[PDB]
Structures are given as C-alpha cells and as structure tokens.
From a paper:
We identified adenosine 5′-sulfamate (AMS) as a broad specificity compound that hijacks a range of aaRSs; and ML901 as a specific reagent that hijacks a single aaRSs in the malaria parasite, Plasmodium falciparum, namely, tyrosine RS (PfYRS). The target enzyme catalyzes the formation of an inhibitory amino acid-sulfamate conjugate, via a reaction-hijacking mechanism. To confirm that recombinant PfYRS can generate the ML901-Tyr conjugate, we incubated PfYRS with substrates and ML901, then precipitated the tRNA and protein. To obtain crystals of ML901-Tyr-bound PfYRS, we incubated His-tagged PfYRS with tyrosine, ATP and ML901 in the presence of tRNA and then purified the complex using nickel affinity and gel filtration chromatography. In combination, these observations indicate different conformations of the KMSKS loop in individual monomers within the dimer. Potency and selectivity of ML901 for PfYRS thus appears to be associated with a stabilized loop over the active site.
Like E1 enzymes, aminoacyl tRNA synthetases (aaRSs) are adenylate-forming enzymes (AFEs). They catalyze the transformation of amino acids into AMP conjugates, and then into aminoacyl-tRNAs, to supply protein synthesis. PfYRS is a Class I aaRS, characterized by a catalytic domain that adopts a Rossmann fold (residues 18–260) linked to a C-terminal domain (residues 261–370) that is involved in recognition of the anticodon stem of tRNATyr. PfYRS contains the two motifs characteristic of the catalytic domain of Class I (sub-class c) tRNA synthetases: “HIGH” and “KMSKS” (70HIAQ73 and 247KMSKS251 in PfYRS).
Residue numbers in the entry:
A (entry chain A): 20 to 247, 255 to 372
B (entry chain B): 17 to 372
The structure:
C-alpha cells in the first residue's frame, strides 16, 4: 500500500500547486484512490479566436491530469455560445469556431487518446430526455436570486438587462456536470458559482457522488484595468511582440501583472525553468530554476519590465510555433482559420 | 357574385358564433383571415395532470371543441405532464402525473366530443420526438425576454410574486410559449388566465419578424361554487364540481352554492347556466312544479337574464335546473366509468393520490 499512497499524495500536491482552489482536497484523494479513470472536463463557448489561457495554459493542467490515467473532456459549448449572444447567435459560425478550437488543441498538446472533444448540442440531442430532465429538476431546486449569483460564468452582471437566458444558461451548465458524469470540474475561478451549485444540488437530492471543483487561476488581461487586450492562439510573432511590449507590467508588482502571470503560469511550467536573456549592464543572462527566485528578483527590481517582456514574448512565440506550423501546413486547417477570421465578435 | 357572396357570408357567421363561446379574442380580424384558408386551423389547449378533473376542463371544454371542430378546425389536447412536474404537481411524481393524464383522456373520450378532428398529445413524448427543434425554440425565447417580463406570466402556473420564485417559474413560461410554435398552432384556445404567455408568443413573433402570429381565443373562467371564488379550482376547497361526482354530490354542492336573488353579477349558478347548459342545449328549459309557476323554455340568454334579475325565476328553481342539466351532461362520463372496468380502476387509482 505504501507505493500506492505515496504517489497519490505527491499527485495531489502537484495538482494543488498549479490549481488556485480545490473544493475539499480530501474528496479528491478519495477519487484519486479509485480503481478507475476519473472524468475531468472543461467547457468552452466558441465565441471567436481562442485566448492563450484556453490553449497554452489549458494544456499544462490537462497533461498533468491525463498522464495519471484520467480522461479529460473538452465540452464544446456551442448551444451555450448561442444562448450567450456570441457570434451574433449564428450557430453555423459557432460550429466553425468549435472546429477551429479542436485544431488548435490537437496542435498544442491535446492530440491524445485520453482527451475527448464533445459537442454540447450533439451529446444533448443523443439523450434529450435524460439531459432536459436534469435541467428541469435543477430549476425546481433553486430560486431566481440564487441562480443570478452565477452571472459571472457568462461574463454578465446583475447591473444590466437580465434576460431569461441568464437563468437558463447556469441550469444547463450545472446539468452538464451530472450528464457527463464528471468527477473533477476543471474550469476557471470565474466558473465556481455554478460549480458550487452542483455540489449544493447533490446535498438537496441526497447524491453522494459529488464532483470535485478544481479551479485554475484567471490570467489577467494585457491592459491595466483588466483581471481576466489579450494573446490569441493564432497571433503571429509580430502580433505577440507588439502586444507584449504594449502590455501592462508594473515594476516590483506581481498582482494583476499579465506579463509575470504568463511567465509564472505558462512559461515556467512548460520548461521547468525560465531563461532570462539580458545584456550584461542590465544583469546579464540568468537561468531561474524556481519561481521563488523569479518572484524575488522581480519584486526587488532586479528584473526590469522591459527585460521580462522580451523574454516572455520570445517564449510565447516558441510555444505557439507548433500551432502556427499546423495551420500553415494543414490546408484544411488553414481554410478553417481564414474563414473564422471574417466574423464579428458579439 | 353567386359563390362570392355566399362564401363571405358563412365566414362571418362562423366568426360570429366562435366569438360567442369566447371571452376575449386578440384581433378578430386575424381570426377571419385564418378562416379564409381551405386547410384546417390548428387549435390547442394544455392541461397539467394534477388530480381530479372538474367541469371547467371537461364539460365546458367539450362545448368549445365541438364548436371549433364542426367549423373546420383541428383541436389538440396537450397533456402537459412535464409542466405539472415542473409546477410540483402530484408531489412532482411523474408516474402519478402520467396516470392522471390517462384519466383525463378517458374523461374527454366520453364527454361527447367529435373525435375525428381531436388529438391527444403528451408533452414529454412529442418533445422527445423532435428535441432539437423544441429546445432550440425554448433557448431562443429565453434570449428574447428579460426576467421581469417573464415573471408577469406567473399566473399561468397559479403562482404569485409574494412567494419564493424558483427558476422553474422562468422555464415553465418559456416552454409553454415554445409549445405554440412547436405545434404550429393557429389558435391558442385556453382560459383567460393564460393570456400573459399567449401575449408573449405574439410579442415573440414581432421580435423575430414572424408574419404568422397565433390568434388568442380565450374563454372565461368558470367561477367556483361559493361567493367570491372567481375561478373553479381544486386548490380552492369546496369550489368545484368534478367529472366523477355523483348525482347526490352535484345536487348537494349546487344547493349550498352561491346564487343571490335578482342579480347575475358574480353568480356562479347563473354562470353554469350561461357558459355550460345553454350552449349544450341551445335553450334553457326551466322545469318547475305548478306550485312554483310550471315549466318555461328560454330560447335566448337575454330572456333568461331578464326573468332572473326581475325576480320571475327564484334562485332555488335556477339551482334545481342547473343541477339537473349538469347531472345529465355528466351521465355519459358516469356510464363510461361504470361500464369500462379498465377506466373504473383507473379512476379509483388516481383518487388515492395526494393533491399538491
Ligand atoms: N483570461 C482567462 N484566464 C484563465 N482562464 C480563462 C480565461 C478566459 O477568458 C475568457 F474571458 F475569454 N476563460 N478562461 C476559462 O476558459 C474556459 C472557457 O471560457 S468561456 O468561453 O468563456 N466558457 C464559459 O465561461 C462557460 N460558461 C462555458 C461552459 C458551458 C457548459 C459547461 O458544462 C461548462 C462550461 C472556462 O473554464 C474559463 O473559466
Ligand atoms: N375554473 C376554470 N374555468 C375555465 N377555464 C379554466 C378553469 C381552470 O381552473 C384551474 F385553476 F384549475 N383552468 N381553466 C383552463 O383550463 C386549462 C388547463 O388548466 S391547468 O391545468 O391549470 N394548465 C395551465 O395552467 C397551463 N400552464 C398548462 C399548459 C402548458 C403548456 C402549454 O403549451 C399550454 C398549457 C387552461 O387553458 C386553463 O386556462
Ligand atoms: Cl434519453
Ligand atoms: Cl429535432
Ligand atoms: Mg483524443
Ligand atoms: Mg382523433
């Protein structure tokens, strides 16, 4: 039993280090000690070009989970994007974007057996009685104001026009968790309200198989007053360099620093190091083997923001290269990327 | 002319008697245009299976359906089983709800309706046959209206703002609104308490620039037996005559019913004579002992209204005749549930449920 318990403890510690919040790691240990494959999932509204957090950052946690034997589902939330007034509600364009998402994921670390690309409308229509019965029962269990606390999962707020779709959307997202038999909800922190709703629903219905909530931190925006104007998976080297140099990067400050966050959350996990290239008069080249020294050097002003930007832009361009090469060589992926670049984001 | 004059003449007489069994028709101009089609018009009413059926949903409904089906319409009975589940009927138990729905169909099949142009559709069954079409409608309707506009439809569920409002009370009117388009309904023929969601569907047509808008042909609410009961309902105790009540129960309920002398306002006994008995028989034959003035036949409603308001018809005489005619109209239903052994046990089974 020793070797069986040793690895699970170090698995949990590596998971909790790359995850911002885990609702009860004690339950996660119970599921990690199961003689089966766990079901993890994340969901995505095909609303346009893919954010760097949904591709490069996503591959880091996904490969950590799948390499231990877990299955990770990519929930292509096409009906949710239509419900959330994305892509002018055109479901035809949404499915085009969804196909572009699969091509990006397959070229940035998710061309794997333990990854599944599931379309929301396709899977719901296969078992509609089961899915919609879930949605109905969930709506019967919570009041309006409790459901309006989940408005953040759509990028909305209670200060604007609150449409009935904003009540229906979280009922369906809560239903997906049971419909997909999810063990671990691996979504961003901005999704935790509806994730806490599914656990609350289990207590109401006396369901003992409660999903574990494993939230990953939100990558801040490139500009100043931003916490969630961004790097896209299709940006060329010229675009990444232009966006990084104009980005917000306050000296000695780590919070809401999108440049440091890219180095801490994407670059460092992907390389197990951070090679900072500088001129000698600015401190010279230095190889960082721990985030503790990187944080210390930036807070104390050892790393100037200009030097951090140039290295972050260089690393991001290295990580985006297999994506660029897939879209420049796979002609069917190129035409798919060229077509979705013609859409108005709503 | 020849055929043009005769054709336009029968359309206006079909329009005139349809509006007679109607409390409010949202745009009669639209209804006359609908009748100008050689195809059958699709009308529908929906029912939550939530226990015993009372006469407003059985006797009163058969009169309206017979008038529509004999005038070139097809009528759909929409068994709203999932809606009853969504509204916490029969303790939400979907198995009990489906048995009540089967009991409803047994009553309607023995109410004396022309079954050739009548269909019974289960919501859950039809939705699951075309779930992509149906739920796409629900989703698009939810995108079109805000929560405050949707909460104006709470009365279609018998709900109020003063109580805790669950999300089911937002999804319910979105689904009922979608039913109208899912069934390709030309005429929403429901009670007037349903008009808010019927107005929502017409507003949805204007949002989506849909030119085929449904006609709202609402019927009045049959009042309850006691004074002040504006609507007969099983949620209001002692207010209803049920389709399974015996002659003794009907007589006993009507004798204690509210029937103020010389006034028809808020008079439920007079309402049963007007909305149920008179349209069924096309006359009201008031039977009386010679001690009390002998029999008298009323061929129009005003003749009946005039004799009652001025005191020529005593309340007891009106109550005795209303009880007798209702007992006669319920007789084919009683015959079915006493001769059809399978229907009798079905009635016995649903009466063992607890109403919620
Ligand atoms: N800057 C950032 N940093 C770190 N993580 C980030 C972002 C970011 O930026 C953004 F604003 F564009 N998204 N995410 C994360 O990526 C994923 C998809 O995002 S989404 O398209 O918006 N879908 C939704 O929100 C969900 N309602 C869709 C959904 C629907 C049904 C389900 O059963 C499950 C999910 C979710 O996990 C998000 O948390
Ligand atoms: N006393 C009375 N006099 C005259 N008409 C009366 C009543 C009465 O009494 C009551 F309180 F018990 N109901 N009705 C009328 O009968 C019908 C069913 O009634 S219900 O079971 O409550 N279904 C609902 O309310 C609807 N949400 C169900 C529904 C769901 C989806 C649809 O696509 C369409 C409909 C509707 O037409 C009602 O208006
Ligand atoms: Cl199913
Ligand atoms: Cl379909
Ligand atoms: Mg795969
Ligand atoms: Mg038939």
């Amino acid at each position: 039993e020793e070797s069986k318990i040793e690895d699970v403890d170090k698995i949990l510690n590596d998971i909790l280090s790359i995850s911002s919040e885990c609702i009860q790691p004690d339950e996660l240990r119970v599921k990690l000690l199961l003689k089966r494959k766990l079901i993890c999932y994340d969901g995505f509204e095909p609303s346009g070009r893919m954010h760097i957090a949904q591709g490069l950052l996503k591959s880091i946690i996904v490969n950590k989970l799948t390499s231990n034997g877990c299955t990770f589902i990519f929930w292509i939330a096409d009906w949710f994007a239509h419900l959330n007034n994305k892509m002018s509600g055109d479901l035809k364009k949404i499915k085009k974007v969804g196909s572009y998402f699969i091509e990006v994921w397959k070229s940035c670390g998710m061309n794997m057996e333990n990854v599944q690309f599931l379309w929301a409308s396709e899977e719901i229509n296969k078992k509609p009685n089961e899915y919609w019965s879930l949605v109905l029962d969930i709506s019967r269990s919570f009041n309006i104001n409790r459901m309006k606390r989940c408005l953040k999962i759509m990028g909305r707020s209670e200060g604007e026009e609150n449409y009935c779709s904003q009540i229906l959307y979280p009922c369906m997202q809560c239903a997906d968790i049971f419909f997909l038999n999810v063990d671990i909800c691996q979504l961003g922190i901005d999704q935790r309200k509806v994730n806490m709703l599914a656990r609350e629903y289990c207590d109401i219905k006396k369901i003992k198989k409660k999903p574990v909530i494993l939230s990953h931190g939100m990558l801040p925006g490139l500009l100043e007053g931003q916490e969630k104007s961004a790097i896209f998976m299709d940006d060329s080297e010229s675009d990444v360099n232009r966006k990084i140099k104009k980005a917000y990067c306050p000296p000695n400050v780590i919070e809401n620093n999108p440049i440091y966050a890219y180095a801490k959350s994407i670059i460092f996990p992907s390389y197990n190091e951070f090679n900072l290239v500088r001129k000698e008069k600015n401190g010279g080249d230095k190889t960082y083997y721990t985030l503790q020294e990187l944080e210390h050097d930036y807070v104390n002003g050892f790393i100037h923001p200009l030097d951090l930007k140039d290295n972050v832009a260089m690393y991001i361009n290295k990580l985006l290269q297999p994506v660029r090469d897939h879209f420049q060589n796979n002609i069917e992926a190129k035409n798919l990327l060229n077509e979705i670049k013609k859409y108005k984001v709503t």
